[PDB]
Design a binder for this molecule. Structure first.
Ligand SMILES: Nc1ncnc2c1ncn2[C@@H]1O[C@@H]2COP(=O)(O)O[C@H]2[C@H]1O
Ligand SMILES: Nc1ncnc2c1ncn2[C@@H]1O[C@@H]2COP(=O)(O)O[C@H]2[C@H]1O
Ligand SMILES: Nc1ncnc2c1ncn2[C@@H]1O[C@@H]2COP(=O)(O)O[C@H]2[C@H]1O
Lengths: 203, 200
C-alpha cells in the first residue's frame, strides 16, 4: 500500500462503505451517478451473455477507482457488474461532487485517467487473446499472467498460483469441464502441475 | 470550439494518404495525435500478421493517448489511415503543460477513453461468447442495423468486403468466404457479391 495528501483530500469528500466478500457493489444497467475508490480489498469486474454466462474483465484492487465510465456524460448506465472478491472498504462520491474536486485540483483526474488508459491497454490485449488464441492457449496464457502476479508463491519446479476451474473458465470463456480437460492436457505435456485448486506453472 | 482551436494551435498538423501507417505498435510513445480530418483503423495482429481491428476513429478523435500517463511505454497497436487524413500532433510534455492551463482538454480526452473502454469491453464479451460463425453473423446483423444499411425487399442490404469482415472478427478472408456460403446455404443471407442481403 501507499497514500498521499492528494488522495486523503479526495477521500475526505467520500463516504466509506463495507462490502463482504461476494457482495455486488455495482449492477450492470444501473444509472451511473457515483464514482468509487477501493480503500481496501479486491473486486472482479464482469459481464454476462443472454444465457447468464459470466466473463471476468478485470480484477481491481486497493487504490483502484471503480464506476468511472459514466463520469463524462450524464444518463449512462453501469457497463458491467462489480463484485467483491474479498471483504472490501470502498469510498464513494457523486459524479457532481467529483467534478467540483477536479476543478480544485486536476491531478485527481490525472490519476483516474492513468487507470483508464491502463485498463484500455489490458482490455485490448484481452481482445487479441480471445481473437487469436484457442481455448488452450488462452488458458496457457492466463496461467502465465497469474504466475507473474504479486500473489505468486515460489516453488522448486517453478512458480505457483491458486485458482479454480470455474475462475479460469470465466476468464477465458469456457466451461469448468473444458478447463479440467485442458489442465490435464497441459499437465501431460509437462507444463504444469495441478494439486486440487493449486497450480504449479513450470518456468 | 475555443478549447479545440487553442489546443490545435500548439500542435503541428500533417497530411497522411489513405493506407499509410500513423502509429506502429511497439514504438516509444511520446506524442499525442488528434484527427482533424479523415478516419483511421486501430489494429492488432497475431504472430503471423493476421489482423484484427479494435476500433475506427474519426475526426475529433484523439489517438496515441495510451502512453500519456507513464513514461517509457510503447504504442499498444498499429493505427492506419482508412481515408486521407489530416492529423494534429503534439508531444506528451507539451500536452501536460496544456492540461495545467486548462484541464477541460484532459476531460475531453478522458471522455473518449471511457467510451473506448465501454465499447472494447462489449467486444471482449462477443469474442468470449460467440464462435467465428457467431461473430460473423453478429457483425452482419450489426451492420444491417447501421444508419447506412440500405432497404432491400428481403431484409437489409450492406456493403462490406470479405477482408473487412475478417478484420472485424479476427479471421482470414478465406474463412469469411466459407462461412458466408454456409450462411447463404442456411437461407440467412444472400451474398450477391455487389452486396450482402441480411434477410428479415
Ligand atoms: N474493461 C474494463 N477494465 C476495467 N474496469 C472495467 C472494464 N469495464 C468496466 N469496468 C469497471 O466496471 C465498472 C462498472 O460501471 P461503470 O461503467 O460506471 O465503470 C466501470 C469500470 O469501473
Ligand atoms: N463461451 C463460454 N462457454 C461456457 N462457459 C462460458 C463461456 N464464456 C464464459 N463462460 C462462463 O465461464 C464459467 C466458468 O465455469 P462454469 O462452467 O461453472 O460456468 C462458466 C460460464 O458462466
Ligand atoms: N481498444 C482501443 N480502442 C480505441 N483506440 C485504441 C484501442 N487500443 C488502442 N487504441 C489506440 O491505438 C493507439 C496506438 O498507440 P497508443 O498506445 O499510444 O494509443 C492508442 C490508442 O489511441
Amino acid at each position: 500500500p501507499q497514500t498521499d495528501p492528494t488522495l486523503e483530500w479526495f477521500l475526505s469528500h467520500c463516504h466509506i462503505h463495507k462490502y463482504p466478500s461476494k457482495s455486488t457493489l455495482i449492477h450492470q444497467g444501473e444509472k451511473a451517478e457515483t464514482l468509487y475508490y477501493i480503500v481496501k480489498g479486491s473486486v472482479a469486474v464482469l459481464i454476462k451473455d443472454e444465457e447468464g454466462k459470466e466473463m471476468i474483465l478485470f480484477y481491481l484492487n486497493q487504490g483502484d477507482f471503480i464506476g468511472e465510465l459514466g463520469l463524462f456524460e450524464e444518463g449512462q448506465e453501469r457497463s458491467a457488474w462489480v463484485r467483491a472478491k474479498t471483504a472490501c472498504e470502498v469510498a464513494e462520491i457523486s459524479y457532481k461532487k467529483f467534478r467540483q474536486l477536479i476543478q480544485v485540483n486536476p491531478d485527481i483526474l490525472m490519476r483516474l485517467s492513468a487507470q483508464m488508459a491502463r485498463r484500455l491497454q489490458v482490455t485490448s490485449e484481452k481482445v487479441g487473446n480471445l481473437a487469436f488464441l484457442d481455448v488452450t492457449g488462452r488458458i496457457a496464457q492466463t496461467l502465465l499472467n497469474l504466475a507473474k502476479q504479486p500473489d505468486a508463491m515460489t516453488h522448486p519446479d517453478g512458480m505457483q498460483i491458486k485458482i479454480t476451474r470455474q475462475e479460469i473458465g470465466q476468464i477465458v470463456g469456457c466451461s469448468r469441464e473444458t478447463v479440467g480437460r485442458i489442465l490435464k492436457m497441459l499437465e501431460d505435456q509437462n507444463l504444469i502441475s495441478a494439486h486440487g485448486k493449486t497450480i504449479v506453472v513450470y518456468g
